Write a protein that binds this ligand. Structure first.
Ligand SMILES: Nc1nc2c(c(=O)[nH]1)N[C@H]1C(S)=C(S)[C@@H](COP(=O)(O)OP(=O)(O)OC[C@H]3O[C@@H](n4cnc5c(=O)[nH]c(N)nc54)[C@H](O)[C@@H]3O)O[C@H]1N2
Ligand SMILES: Nc1nc2c(c(=O)[nH]1)N[C@H]1C(S)=C(S)[C@@H](COP(=O)(O)OP(=O)(O)OC[C@H]3O[C@@H](n4cnc5c(=O)[nH]c(N)nc54)[C@H](O)[C@@H]3O)O[C@H]1N2
Ligand code: SF4
Ligand code: SF4
Ligand code: SF4
Ligand code: SF4
Ligand SMILES: [S]
Ligand SMILES: [W+6]
Lengths: 214, 963
């Protein structure tokens, strides 16, 4: 299988990833407004598979710790969401055995969408209020199968986004965690054994987002 | 295969936004015969390696955008509606306006009876967005027609700084390049928000940190840049010179300068004349009536041969280095800390990290962009940066340099092609009315009697003559010299510049404006004034991608179209990915890009618009005569076109240049029609043409070097990332300027592990050497008259050393460093109803006035509306909740915005009072989207600096009220 290593100690919140995901899939733009933040869209939705979350945390002396979290489906090794969906119709959620990708098919209109989202420990799935389809990050599985990096990974300028074979990535994450600790000594890997999207957080994952970790 | 890409033709392009110059791959349907289906990063491009920020990443949505213009539109005087019109109509009628305005306004000779051959009744804005061949062609068309009022973006952000670099090093340009940042040991980002404004640069900045570098952000605001630096140091607006002067005193006090470099390569050892003095904030030669200096009082003491005297022991009290120590001893830690608002501990931390790079085998770089350098002492801010870098030996080295980040993708190129009033292409001055002959124009270049001083500008007669041959190949250059317009030797140069074009417009003194690839109704300070002033034009020609606040100023807020007489032609141009040509990035990399999709609808590339337009004017002169026809009739536009269309390729070859006969030069035989291989082989006798001497070496008999996509590198090239076989940079592919300074007088690098050049077996290896010659036989700064890096800079209007003069008028009354509060060489009202310092800046997701990005749904989705950023303290004081609507007002205008209350903004402490800074983006405009807001330039003043002629967009007084 394949793994993302997401080094958030390198993120500039350029939102290249957010725009790239929509360009590759030709997704529509939400209606948004500023409600006191750079963050927009405020949330994942049917047509938004990745949003960069912004959090300001007070620190001693000048400036802040400004925490950026580009949110996507973690492509869990043992997907809760499938287990929930395989109760209404085994088929709506499958696992590509090549890539590791957890994929929502057209059959998700038949299952209880509401229920699949609640099963997700990362609150990832989103429902089309028309077609009742469940939508989320599909790992750009077409591109991966064709030996291309996912759009969000190729676009990232900082070296935050990394993709590859689960072995090389876990290797890289351990070696990167050691280096990053020298600057952010409270840095940790998010649920590195359960997921295919391993975030390096610079501190308490929960400071980046309520569902940053399970 | 991926179905989306399977049947599409793949071409390469270069991002149309910022001057990083990221590579694209464009997929086009029907094997190139239809529309774009995908745009993403070019994985092979060595600057971005496939990555794009959201601006480049959204170029598909910019290009395939059904809000784009489709055909010319016409707005009759007092009409309240566009009528769609043919290209034929638009261009023939525009050619008639130009002819009528020119025939009626042309002046052979001014008051003083001097030949000027010009029209002052037509002005042109734009553009850094056009391809280099379009910029060159555009300038030559406007000058053939007799224009002098020719300006673009560069005036606003780079013009106030370039002369700092020219004085210090001999050239105006960024000294290194993006990839080189990875080689730095300490990166000081000061007057730049590069993580948002040059986002792919942070690939190389964070790579420098991987290798051990400390990253320092010095900014009044905590930004996305700040979040990823080791050190964030807040500085109050305008306290940059105190900060940098304190760093100079720290370097000299602690003896952290690179001694051998300083002795050999800088003017540290030059003896300044006994007439040089400084006291209480005034240098010698001050004329208090005219607020102006006699700079002759700053002259060097010259030897018997006319060469500045040197004491290599550095003992003489009038040695530059000794006068330098004396000048900066006033910038102690306590004084600097108090004015900057930066803690003494944080100043010490930043000084010690950065000055550690004075070590020969360590390199420091400084990145600045626009910052707050717009004001009258911005040039002196950049002088202090240059002088610090020279003291530490960081000029000419890998990971070193002054990286003056360019803004727009081709603002480097547009400047190089002379789309500013004071320069022809290749930085040859526009003649003034006293330059009666070419011989006399050429007489003004200073000479050096120092044999070690290359003084390269002595070659200027070759460039000017080779230039006049590319415009007027059948005339003698001396004769051609008389076709091109001249400015008044009597007038202040700034009378021909951006801010005074608006001032003149508002007085009805212009009949015609070209708004070519610019949006002045949002870009100009005091938009209220400029929008009204655009009413006082007979005709406006706007060439742009979309209908906008400039094309449609006549139906903007508070305007009644009936009252407004200005006739408007809107000419829709094609996007970057729908045309071929070159753009010159910040690093001077001139990069070729190709057409992917054919032009949308009836849009045209700028080249075809401008060529066809000029052809109509020329045919009109050739039928009905009119004012001084020769410059128009004789211009060689034939070398510009191929199969009836503008040819980027042929124009680029003309820009590089070719021999008009068999010729011997540098003892080599050259056949007529051969491409000039380098500016080293141009002639002043008319043997050679070159549209731009800097471009000599760019397109040779070997072919188009700008279109090279070769990652081939020797090990010493790859160790520092030169990529010399990837495109082409001026001059002659010298990737790091001043690189002779990177080695001792035997040709051995100061830092072997990051050599730039190295003398090995009779030859310079690595970069192309910046100036030919054996080690230790030439001074390293070959464009300098004297050949040294200038610590002491006696050509600057404000004085030879940077001195703090307060650029914030309103909240400051005392200068800690002298009795002199403001720049003694430069009328803010400071009305107390406006107590807050307003400032404008950028976000990553929007571009300039937002004319392009406000049409892009994904970018509006991330940043939908104008906002106002304020501290919790100012939030507390004005009763403003996060996300509340606020009214921001000034003497000039008012607008509504969403409050962002953030700890990232802090109050300033100025003479024991809290002063609140309020932050706005200037990416918004009344045209689009719905609820976006209007330009922050409703708030800004159009009062600028008598000497820079640049407006004030970074510190202007406002009030902010909850609504
Ligand atoms: N995303 C994006 N990138 C752009 C552009 C764009 O519109 N959007 N425009 C491009 C253009 S044309 C240009 S010229 C460049 C400009 O690039 P930048 O100069 O980086 O742009 P700004 O954000 O205007 O200003 C930079 C920073 O200067 C800080 N600053 C303000 N006053 C002072 C001061 O007194 N001292 C110091 N040290 N800092 C101060 C501001 O707080 C801000 O963080 O960016 C280019 N890149
Ligand atoms: N308050 C405030 N005002 C500022 C600034 C600030 O910091 N604060 N920044 C200043 C600076 S640095 C600058 S550079 C100016 C910029 O001001 P402008 O250049 O007027 O701004 P835009 O027009 O938004 O810049 C991009 C333009 O390029 C055009 N374009 C794109 N591609 C092409 C093409 O192929 N051909 C043609 N003809 N046009 C094309 C787009 O349509 C768009 O009009 O604004 C200045 N104004
Ligand atoms: S992996 Fe693909 S689908 Fe998932 S967030 Fe990235 S670009 Fe979007
Ligand atoms: S993160 Fe949620 S939606 Fe994605 S695989 Fe896990 S359980 Fe499923
Ligand atoms: S592209 Fe990379 S640096 Fe930019 S927001 Fe996404 S993950 Fe962060
Ligand atoms: S805007 Fe600048 S950094 Fe962003 S993709 Fe374009 S060239 Fe690269
Ligand atoms: S610019
Ligand atoms: W600019």
């Amino acid at each position: 299988g394949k793994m993302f290593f997401v080094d958030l100690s390198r993120c500039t919140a350029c939102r290249g990833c957010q725009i790239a995901c929509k360009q590759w899939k030709n997704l529509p733009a939400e209606e948004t407004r500023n409600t006191g933040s750079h963050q927009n869209p405020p949330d994942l939705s049917y047509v938004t598979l990745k949003t960069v979350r912004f959090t300001e945390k007070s620190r001693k002396g000048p400036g802040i710790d400004w925490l950026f979290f580009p949110e996507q489906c973690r492509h869990c090794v043992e997907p809760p969401c499938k287990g929930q969906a395989d109760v209404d119709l085994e088929g709506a959620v499958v696992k590509d055995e090549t890539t590791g990708a957890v994929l929502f098919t057209e059959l998700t209109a038949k299952v209880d969408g509401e229920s699949v989202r609640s099963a997700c420990p990362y609150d990832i799935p989103r429902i089309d209020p028309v077609t009742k389809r469940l939508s989320k990050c599909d790992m750009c599985n077409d591109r991966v199968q064709n030996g291309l990096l996912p759009a969000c990974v190729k676009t990232c300028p900082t070296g935050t986004m990394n993709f590859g074979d689960e072995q090389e990535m876990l290797a890289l994450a351990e070696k990167r965690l050691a280096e990053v600790k020298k600057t952010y000594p409270g840095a940790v890997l998010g649920d590195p054994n359960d997921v295919r999207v391993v975030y390096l957080f610079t501190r308490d994952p929960k400071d980046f987002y309520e569902h940053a970790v399970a | 295969e991926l179905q989306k890409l399977q049947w599409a033709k793949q071409t390469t392009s270069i991002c149309c936004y910022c001057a990083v110059g990221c590579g694209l791959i464009v997929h086009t349907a029907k094997d190139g015969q239809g529309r774009a289906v995908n745009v993403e990063g070019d994985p092979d491009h060595p600057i971005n390696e496939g990555s794009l920020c959201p601006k480049g990443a959204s170029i598909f949505q910019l290009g395939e955008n059904d809000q784009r213009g489709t055909q010319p539109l016409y707005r009759a005087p007092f009409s309240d509606t566009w009528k769609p019109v043919t290209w034929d109509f638009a261009l023939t009628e525009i050619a008639k306006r130009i002819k009528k305005t020119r025939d009626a306004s042309f002046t052979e000779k001014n008051a003083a009876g001097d030949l000027v051959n010009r029209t002052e009744a037509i002005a042109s804005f734009g553009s850094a967005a056009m391809d280099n061949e379009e910029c060159w062609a555009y300038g030559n068309i406007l000058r053939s027609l007799g224009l002098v009022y020719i300006e673009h973006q560069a005036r606003i952000x780079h013009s106030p700084t370039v002369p700092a670099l020219a004085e210090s090093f001999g050239r105006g340009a960024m000294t290194n390049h993006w990839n080189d940042l990875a080689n730095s040991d300490c990166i000081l980002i000061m007057g730049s928000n590069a993580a948002e404004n040059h986002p792919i640069a942070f690939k190389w900045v964070l790579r420098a940190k991987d290798k051990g570098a400390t990253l320092i952000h010095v900014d009044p605001r905590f930004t996305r840049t700040s979040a990823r630096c080791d050190v964030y140091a807040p500085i109050r607006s305008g306290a940059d010179i105190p900060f940098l002067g304190g760093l100079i005193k720290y370097i000299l006090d602690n003896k952290l300068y690179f001694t051998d470099y300083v002795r050999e390569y800088t003017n540290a050892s030059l003896i300044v004349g006994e007439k040089f003095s400084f006291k209480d904030g005034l240098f010698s030669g001050y004329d208090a009536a005219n607020k102006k200096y006699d700079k002759s009082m700053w002259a060097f003491e010259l030897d018997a041969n006319g060469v500045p005297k040197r004491d290599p022991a550095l003992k003489h009290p009038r040695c530059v280095i000794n006068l330098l120590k004396k000048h900066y001893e006033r910038y102690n830690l306590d004084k600097v800390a108090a004015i900057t608002g930066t803690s003494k501990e944080q100043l010490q931390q930043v000084y010690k990290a950065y000055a550690a790079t004075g070590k020969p085998d360590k390199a420091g770089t400084i990145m600045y962009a626009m910052g707050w350098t717009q004001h009258s002492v911005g040039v002196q801010n950049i002088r202090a940066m240059a002088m610090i870098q020279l003291l530490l030996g960081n000029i000419g080295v890998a990971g070193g340099g002054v990286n003056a980040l360019r803004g727009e993708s081709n603002v480097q190129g547009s400047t190089d092609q002379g789309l500013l009033a004071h320069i022809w292409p290749g930085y040859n001055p526009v003649p003034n009315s006293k330059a009666a002959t070419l011989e006399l124009y050429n007489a003004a270049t200073p000479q050096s009697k120092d044999p070690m001083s290359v003084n390269w500008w002595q070659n200027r007669p070759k460039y000017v003559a080779s230039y006049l041959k590319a415009l007027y190949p059948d005339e003698e250059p001396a004769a051609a010299y008389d076709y091109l317009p001249r400015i008044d030797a009597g007038r202040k140069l700034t009378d021909y510049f951006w801010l005074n074009i608006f001032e003149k417009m508002d007085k009805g003194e212009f009949k015609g404006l070209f708004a070519w690839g610019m949006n002045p109704a949002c870009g100009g300070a005091n938009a209220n004034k400029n929008r009204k002033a655009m009413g006082k034009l007979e005709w406006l020609v706007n060439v742009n991608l979309f209908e906008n606040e400039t094309s449609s100023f006549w139906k903007g807020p508070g305007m009644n179209p009936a009252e407004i007489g200005t006739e408007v032609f809107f000419l829709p141009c094609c996007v970057s990915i729908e045309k071929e040509g070159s753009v010159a990035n910040s690093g001077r990399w001139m990069q070729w890009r190709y057409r992917g999709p054919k032009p949308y609808a009836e849009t045209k590339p700028d080249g075809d618009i401008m060529l066809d337009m000029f052809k109509k004017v020329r045919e009109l002169y050739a039928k009905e005569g009119g004012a001084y026809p020769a410059p128009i009739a004789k211009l060689n536009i034939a070398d510009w076109e191929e199969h009836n269309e503008f040819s980027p390729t042929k124009v680029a070859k003309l820009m590089n240049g070719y021999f008009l006969k068999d010729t011997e030069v540098g003892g080599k035989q050259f056949k007529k029609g051969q491409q000039v291989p380098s500016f080293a082989f141009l002639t002043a006798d008319g043997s050679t043409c070159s549209g731009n001497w800097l471009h000599a070496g760019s397109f040779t008999d070997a072919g188009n070097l700008m279109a090279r996509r070769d990652k081939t590198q020797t090990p010493e090239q790859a160790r520092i990332g030169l990529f010399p076989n990837w495109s082409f940079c001026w001059p002659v592919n010298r990737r790091i300027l001043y690189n002779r300074a990177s080695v001792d007088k035997t040709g051995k690098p100061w830092n072997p592990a990051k050599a730039v050049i190295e003398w090995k077996d009779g030859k310079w290896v690595g970069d192309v050497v910046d100036g030919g010659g054996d080690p230790g036989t030439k001074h390293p700064f070959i464009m300098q008259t004297h050949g040294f890096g200038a610590l002491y800079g006696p050509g600057r209007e404000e004085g030879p050393f940077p001195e703090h003069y307060e650029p914030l008028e309103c909240p400051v009354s005392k200068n800690p460093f002298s009795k002199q509060l403001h720049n003694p060489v430069a009328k803010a009202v400071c009305d107390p109803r406006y107590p807050f310092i307003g400032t404008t800046y950028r976000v990553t997701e929007h571009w300039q006035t937002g004319l392009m990005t406000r049409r892009c749904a994904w970018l509006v989705e991330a940043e939908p509306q104008i906002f106002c950023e304020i501290s919790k303290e100012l939030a507390k004081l004005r009763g403003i909740g996060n996300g509340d609507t606020v009214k921001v007002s000034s003497l000039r205008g008012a607008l509504e915005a969403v409050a962002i209350v953030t700890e990232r903004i802090r109050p300033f402490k100025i003479e024991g009072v809290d002063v609140h800074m309020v932050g706005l983006p200037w990416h918004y405009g009344w045209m689009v989207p719905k609820n976006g807001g209007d330009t922050a330039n409703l708030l800004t003043p159009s009062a600028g600096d008598p000497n820079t002629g640049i407006p004030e967009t970074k510190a202007f007084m406002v009030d902010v009220r909850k609504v």
